């Protein structure tokens, strides 16, 4: 597996691997332990493969959002920074590296979109989204546009969509509710309507993508763009006198970009967890260590307070941190994949006029949340099935058979559950009386007085279950379940034995 007595570190090729290796050299000088910094290809996919088999690097550097997935597969050790060390980093960066209620990585850097503007065309950039239409008219009179940025990817359009109330997944305690998506609320509609209005009023074109926007800003054709630190060096080569500042407000509220946090995780299979902790806390996450990495290739804004104070001398870095603090931590759960595709489709459909804003987002809410909502409903239905089977078994323990009588019916009326026209189980032990009945339908348990094994439960759910949903029931039980009437009133019968 992983060789003890040493540190293998994986970081992406676009980061400062030379500087990190120099921090490694200071570590080997003080301790004798060699540090191998490599930047292999496809590092994001290679780690989950090799780490599951109990191999790989000791420390993996990657954007925090993948780490929640890694943690679910148990590939990451819980880190143990003392309170004194935690206060050296901005509190909001620690929230980006939590899964369950556990710290699962060290925050390194902080990144978010900003407003980039051409100082020659526009020495005072607009504070509000609302004033950009008038600005575009005044600039189109001189052959220039106000604002071009990538409209094809919801990462770039989300700051406006979220400003008045949009969100990806609600965050509560230390967990995301994968059932609560904020794509079709009034705030998200208002933000997307403003975006579409900009396009219908000819202030932007629905076909603008990353390359068109970057080319237009670099050739001084548009006064503003929206982009991240990765784009700065191509504007330097362009020689355009540019600035970087806070994103415009919408309805008086800041734009809310997604925040990406470069993070260092410790492989759960590492026999060098103490060495890795010592390296990350007392060598890398210092002014001297981050300086080493930044001088090789800049980090942007950093989570370490002391060095951020120094990098923030650069107003572009200060703006990145300000937009980040006003933004939304990108959720670190794998359910974001459905979020990205859903919102990407909605924006493209609404911007090109192929759908209304309401239809686009209603569909997107569905595409992002429906599967997870049903999965919860199926699980609660299966909980009821197991609860009914449990009580039926408990009855046999004390009484002759499964049911006392022949049949029992649960039906839900208007917020209450009714049982025949008389109480059945007749107990203080069972009764259950805690069936969610997630599809509000009817349950009917069947038995015939005699030799046992005739335990059949008939469920008549109200509400269409998906193919994926009904097929989950087929893999969970097998030949013991008969879905009849695949249309109208679907009927499900399970033999509880």
Residue numbers in the entry: 1 to 370, 1026 to 1152
How did the manuscript describe this experimental structure?
Previously, our group and others found that type IV pili, filamentous helical appendages polymerized from protein subunits, promoted microcolony and biofilm formation in C. difficile. T4P are helical fibers extended from the cell surface through the noncovalent polymerization of thousands of protein subunits called pilins. Here, we report the ability of two C. difficile pilin subunits, PilJ and PilW, to bind to DNA in vitro, as well as the defects in biofilm formation in the pilJ and pilW gene-interruption mutants.
To understand how the incorporation of PilW would alter the T4P fiber, we resolved the X-ray crystal structure of PilW, as a C-terminal fusion to maltose-binding protein (MBP) at 2.5 Å resolution. Fitting with the notion that MBP serves as a sort of molecular chaperone, the relative B-factors are lower for MBP than the majority of PilW, particularly the PilW surface loops. The majority of the two structures is superimposable, including the four strands of the PilA1 β-sheet and the C-terminal α-helix (which is also found in a superimposition of PilA1 and PilJ); the most obvious point of divergence is the αβ loop, which has a short helical section in PilA1, but adds two strands to the β-sheet of PilW. This loop appears to be highly flexible; in the four molecules of the PilW asymmetric unit, it can be traced in two distinct conformations (chains B and C), with insufficient density to resolve it in the other two. The conformer found in chain C of our crystal structure can be accommodated in our pilus model with only minor adjustments to the backbone, while the conformer in molecule B would require a total rearrangement, leading us to conclude that the chain C conformation is close to the native conformation found in the assembled fibers. When PilW subunits are modeled in, the αβ-loop of PilW extends into a groove between PilA1 subunits. Notably, the lysine-rich portion of the αβ loop shown in Figure 4D (residues 67–72) is conserved across the alignment, supporting the hypothesis that this motif is important for DNA recognition. Equivalent residues in similar positions can be observed in the PilW structure, at Lysine 30 and Aspartate 85.
